[PDB]
A paper describes a structure:
The [name] [name] and its orthologs represent the [name] ATPases, which function as monomeric flippases without a β-subunit. The structure reveals a conserved architecture as well as highly similar functional intermediate states relative to dimeric flippases. Most P-type ATPases have a conserved architecture consisting of a transmembrane domain (TMD), an actuator domain (A-domain), a nucleotide-binding domain (N-domain), and a phosphorylation domain (P-domain).
We obtained cryo-EM 3D maps of [name] in the E1-ATP state stabilized by AMPPCP at 5.6-Å resolution, in the [name]-transition state of dephosphorylation stabilized by AlF4− at the 3.1-Å resolution, and in the [name] state as stabilized by BeF3− at 3.2-Å resolution. We first built atomic models into the 3.2-Å resolution map in the [name] state and into the 3.1-Å resolution map in the [name]-transition state. The phosphorylated aspartate is mimicked by the BeF3− moiety in our [name] structure. To enter into the [name] state, both the N and A domains swing away from the membrane and pack tightly together. Furthermore, the conformation and the substrate transport path of [name] in the [name] state highly resemble those of the Drs2, Dnf1, ATP8A1, and ATP11C flippases in the same [name] state. Previous reported Dnf1 structure contained phospholipid molecules in both the substrate entry and exit sites, but we did not capture any endogenous lipid molecules in the [name] substrate sites.
Numbering used by the authors: 154 to 325, 331 to 541, 560 to 713, 732 to 803, 822 to 1141
Write the structure that this text describes.
Amino acid sequence: EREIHPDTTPVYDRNRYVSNELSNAKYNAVTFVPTLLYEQFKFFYNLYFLVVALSQAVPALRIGYLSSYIVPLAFVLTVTMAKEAIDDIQRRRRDRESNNELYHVITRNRSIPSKDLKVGDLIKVHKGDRIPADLVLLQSSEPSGESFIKTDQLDGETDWKLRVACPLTQNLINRISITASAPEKSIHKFLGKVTYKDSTSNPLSVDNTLWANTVLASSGFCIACVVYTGRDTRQAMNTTTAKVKTGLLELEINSISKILCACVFALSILLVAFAGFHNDDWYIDILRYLILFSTIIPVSLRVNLDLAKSVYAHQIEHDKTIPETIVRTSTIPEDLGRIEYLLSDKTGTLTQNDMQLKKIHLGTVSYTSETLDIVSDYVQSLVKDMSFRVRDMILTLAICHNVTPTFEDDELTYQAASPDEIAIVKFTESVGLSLFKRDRHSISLLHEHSGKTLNYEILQVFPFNSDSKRMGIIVRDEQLDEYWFMQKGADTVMSKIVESNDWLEEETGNMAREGLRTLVIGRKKLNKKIYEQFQKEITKYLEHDLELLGLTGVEDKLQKDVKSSIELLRNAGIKIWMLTGDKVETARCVSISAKLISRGQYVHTITKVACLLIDGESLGMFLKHYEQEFFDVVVHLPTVIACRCTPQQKADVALVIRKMTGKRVCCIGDGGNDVSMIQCADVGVGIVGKEGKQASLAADFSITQFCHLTELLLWHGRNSYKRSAKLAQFVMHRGLIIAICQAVYSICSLFEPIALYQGWLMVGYATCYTMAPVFSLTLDHDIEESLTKIYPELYKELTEGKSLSYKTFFVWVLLSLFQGSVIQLFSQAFTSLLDTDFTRMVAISFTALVVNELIMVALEIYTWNKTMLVTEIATLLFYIVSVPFLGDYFDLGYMTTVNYYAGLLVILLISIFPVWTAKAIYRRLHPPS
Ligand code: BEF
Ligand SMILES: [Mg+2]
């Protein structure tokens, strides 16, 4: 229960109810460090380098400089807090640019923003203005009191909802208390009561309410008192709590870093055991060796991953091909590269929700929107036989509807609960005969065109019904005084009752294969006496025999390039689904008209009290009871289509897809009918463009339409995943190659590998001499943006996990074994290892490592830009001018030797020839396309 008094301002303004401000940022100031630290320190490859850094606090485990094990931990902490702090402040900014929308308030007598709006203030909302919160209609501008709200984003419905004002309290201005029930998740149920003086309780229901992201129509203004605001709304109660999202590449890095830790621990144990278990502290040894080997990979991986993710977010949100795209969760820009299941919405996502009557067909000939002059010159002559047939068809289209128009200065606007009739009447006025004032309580319909103003009065009406699919009225002309029964409905209902025609079924099938919601038309000529014979009275008499004029083809307009987008995203192995809270037949028509269901390809259907097309109740009960079996059935169907689903079922479908198969789920949509599934997916994508953008406000990404998901998944995400995989490969290779060089020095000389790279050299390799060409790899792509359309098959080649697999990790480990062994052993052979040639050998080993990395970087570059050819040269020249001028004590040597340069050439050629020839043979046996 919730009782609201609009007059008692302070009792709700100060307290007692939730403020209208919404929150999209997750971390507040007081829990910014514990939540972020506890989220970042569950995974192994963060906790590992944290433990490595904390080890140096103990003086026994001191491997060397304290300015090499504490400063990169501080740097990763600074970068992480900066990234999530920027994300939180940007989320707060994005939320407040939509919290400041101005709304007229009756009691305040001054427009106040949406964030300042409270519960119980009389808001006067105009026609084209988005509803602030959960309003309740108490007064409407129309004398009848009906208002057609536009629930295109509260739920997925594509039809306007008939909302009448409260009949007892519309004529009232006075202050009246509102008592509604406590909030639930029921998006289609409303309960409450309106309280007036002298104990006159009134009933409330869904028919006199407006909800959060709804848009009003069918008026100029209406006096509505807010009842639910903030997180108590029916919109917010259907949104689940957002969870932290870690990419699957993060998990792959976690696993291969776990077994990298196992590998270096085994290498340390081997070195210590081969040493001879001397020095009386074998455990202190193995810990020191483990810290030595595992402090260059696990912390360089973090900086590279984090700043590469920042680079990916910047490069996503600064693309001219995808204008006005927003990255709201920068922790997962590479999950877009491995998406196999996509769960899309229909209204706003696929369809523009603006339907137009495309083709009119009558008498075995068809007229479309193109060549509309013929029907125009036919209708202007209203005041051979096909001319009168067309005239009567346009007359029927302008009479049989249930559109109730309203008047402005100009440019008349139509209002009807079934927008197909609105498309019909817009078509009629485009032909030339325009619908005008209609009573619908008394009997009058005005119409006029290029000629003289017509006039028709109805006699009685039959309302449209869901299970009937029929809409017909009896109308008499004022000028001609003729009784016409004028009646319309669906094809299947009338194919056996309209006439003895022959060409109807073929044309109905032909246009239904185009995804047009066809309506077959009918008209019956009557006189008076039979009418008052009918009026003396079930439905058998009112339907005896009609005359088939023709039928109407009403299309549901799709967004820009949904055909090509769906075809390309199904050519890339992504199993596109379609879950929507909208009706069933229009969902099927949209699916067929979007080529989501191709030619033939029979469609199955389930509705509880190849292809698929399932009702919301059926899917909900199945995923409540028969999870594994039904999901095993549906993974083989090319498309599964859901209808009439609360956001909970779409979120649960995403959860089940990512749980039973363990795969990544993308979910695109707009409005609050798909916020939960966006939050509960592995990737959430939002769409903007209309008066509500809350799904984009709660999403990981944001694009202006559906055509941009093709570039967001097939090109940006795939490149992001490939670049991150190559980055991790190169970082772990450099760490393992220095570890192998140290271990080979340990086996060839019993002192210690810690003594090999001491002081500046190890810090320089860990941070300065190698950080730049990895990010040179970060800015490289194999295929351009223009060719992400012609080759959607490149997206399929990443589904196995060959980029970061155990086999390729062990290939990297074996390659590091080979290359580091070559470097160290050839350095020892060319330097004649002693205690006096130590400087020369460590010099040649470090130079061999550096040039080895700088050549391996140039080997795995697909296309060469000027941000990559320059970075390599900059780092190489930095090393060249940093050997003498900075160190001057370590690794010193003559270095101007012909023998030394030949030795360096040999030790580098032997290291870089296996990888070059392996990629050459892999290119010449598996060419790319
Ligand atoms: F878009 Be789903 F129906 F939540
Ligand atoms: Mg929607």
